[PDB]
Amino acid sequence: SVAHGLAWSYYIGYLRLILPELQARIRTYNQHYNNLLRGAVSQRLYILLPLDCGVPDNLSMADPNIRFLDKLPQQTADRAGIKDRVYSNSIYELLENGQRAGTCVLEYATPLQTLFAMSQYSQAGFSREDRLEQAKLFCRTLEDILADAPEQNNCRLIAYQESFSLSQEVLRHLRQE
Amino acid sequence: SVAHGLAWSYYIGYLRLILPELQARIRTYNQHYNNLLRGAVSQRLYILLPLDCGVPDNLSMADPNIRFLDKLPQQTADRAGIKDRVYSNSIYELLENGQRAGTCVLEYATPLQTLFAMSQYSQAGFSREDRLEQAKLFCRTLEDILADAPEQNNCRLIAYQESFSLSQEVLRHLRQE
Ligand SMILES: Nc1nc(=O)c2ncn([C@@H]3O[C@@H]4COP(=O)(O)O[C@H]5[C@@H](O)[C@H](n6cnc7c(N)ncnc76)O[C@@H]5COP(=O)(O)O[C@@H]3[C@@H]4O)c2[nH]1
Numbered sequence: 001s002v003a004h005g006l007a008w009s010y011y012i013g014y015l016r017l018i019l020p021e022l023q024a025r026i027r028t029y030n031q032h033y034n035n036l037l038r039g040a041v042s043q044r045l046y047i048l049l050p051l052d053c054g055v056p057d058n059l060s061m062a063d064p065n066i067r068f069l070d071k072l073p074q075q076t077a078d079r080a081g082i083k084d085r086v087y088s089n090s091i092y093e094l095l096e097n098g099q100r101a102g103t104c105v106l107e108y109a110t111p112l113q114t115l116f117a118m119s120q121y122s123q124a125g126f127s128r129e130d131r132l133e134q135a136k137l138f139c140r141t142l143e144d145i146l147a148d149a150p151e152q153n154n155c156r157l158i159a160y161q162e163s164f165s166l167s168q169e170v171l172r173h174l175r176q177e
Numbered sequence: 178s179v180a181h182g183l184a185w186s187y188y189i190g191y192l193r194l195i196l197p198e199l200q201a202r203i204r205t206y207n208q209h210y211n212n213l214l215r216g217a218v219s220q221r222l223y224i225l226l227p228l229d230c231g232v233p234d235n236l237s238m239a240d241p242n243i244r245f246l247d248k249l250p251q252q253t254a255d256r257a258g259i260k261d262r263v264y265s266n267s268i269y270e271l272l273e274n275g276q277r278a279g280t281c282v283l284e285y286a287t288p289l290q291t292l293f294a295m296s297q298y299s300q301a302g303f304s305r306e307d308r309l310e311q312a313k314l315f316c317r318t319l320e321d322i323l324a325d326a327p328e329q330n331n332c333r334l335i336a337y338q339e340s341f342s343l344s345q346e347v348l349r350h351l352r353q354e
Pocket residue numbers: 006009010011012013014082085086087088107108109110111114186187189190191192257259262263264265286287288290291
């Protein structure tokens with residue numbers, strides 16, 4: 001299925017490559033680049049999974065209580081003929097009552113953008129019903145993979161359907177640690 | 178199908194983003210960073226499509242007459258919550274009789290790595306026969322998409338099955354311009 005390929009590619013070409021190196025990048029940030037006076041960046045990669053596949057490129061567009069703070073040091077690797085391909089991730093603060101309530105590495109699962117665009121291009125032969133069905137199946141397959149992935153406590157999938165506060169959704173997952 | 182999703186994601190999340198900006202990056206390279214005395218980098222993105230999905234990360238491993246030269250200036254974009262996600266491409270020289278016969282931006286289609294890894298992981302339920310069939314279907318769907326893609330003369334798909342000279346394969350496509 002469409003979702004089966006996208007979930008395996010998200011693992012093979014991304015999570016399995018960056019998750020083993022993420023803990024070290026966060027520590028390096030927390031000790032060398034973070035503000036001396038502010039809270040540490042939390043430890044896991046938080047992955048947003050809107051089942052409606054609405055993926056703005058700016059998180060502050062989805063919720064103004066999610067605001068960009070800084071970048072981790074980037075990770076590079078030679079990949080499929082590209083020397084020093086760059087993997088970069090962004091740190092966000094999460095506001096509650098106008099005060100910072102959390103700091104974490106946060107991003108949307110980019111394959112949901114593919115599902116959305118496929119539902120929009122007639123040549124893809126892919127309906128909005130297909131989109132919802134495959135979005136769900138993508139999340140479930142990714143869950144399946146990560147349950148047995150040796151690359152373990154390194155990320156958190158935040159699946160949701162849409163008075164909805166995305167920042168409150170992330171905070172609920174954050175505060176479970 | 179698996180290949181249908183991977184081909185649409187390769188277009189939507191990569192080719193359609195970098196191909197409109199590639200001509201300008203090559204010109205900037207040719208005028209500012211290229212050796213003053215050497216040939217210009219050719220104009221299109223050459224994409225290698227081994228149907229056996231064997232995708233080494235170092236092209237010099239597939240053919241010693243393909244050797245890394247330099248990187249284009251990188252392209253950055255805000256993407257799905259990642260500030261300044263980096264798109265980078267690498268320039269290769271192509272040797273014939275130990276002399277340089279061409280200079281071009283060259284890389285493997287990374288989704289073929291996903292197909293290969295899926296054939297190797299039992300949890301993917303994906304056979305080596307599936308791999309060949311979907312590799313072919315991935316290439317054909319990508320061909321279909323690009324035939325009508327407004328983002329036109331900007332890349333060249335090099336599909337091949339494996340006394341085979343990869344550098345000679347690329348040169349044949351290069352010299353058709
Ligand atoms: N958040 C995030 N940051 C990343 O760096 C990243 N890289 C991949 N992904 C997703 O992982 C999966 C596997 O990536 P793969 O490289 O095999 O396919 C990629 C790859 O073949 C190509 N591509 C995209 N960006 C680049 C890039 N910088 N360099 C080379 N190829 C790229 O186009 C495909 C789809 O890209 P994305 O649509 O962004 O989603 C991918 C995909 O779902 C990423 N997701």
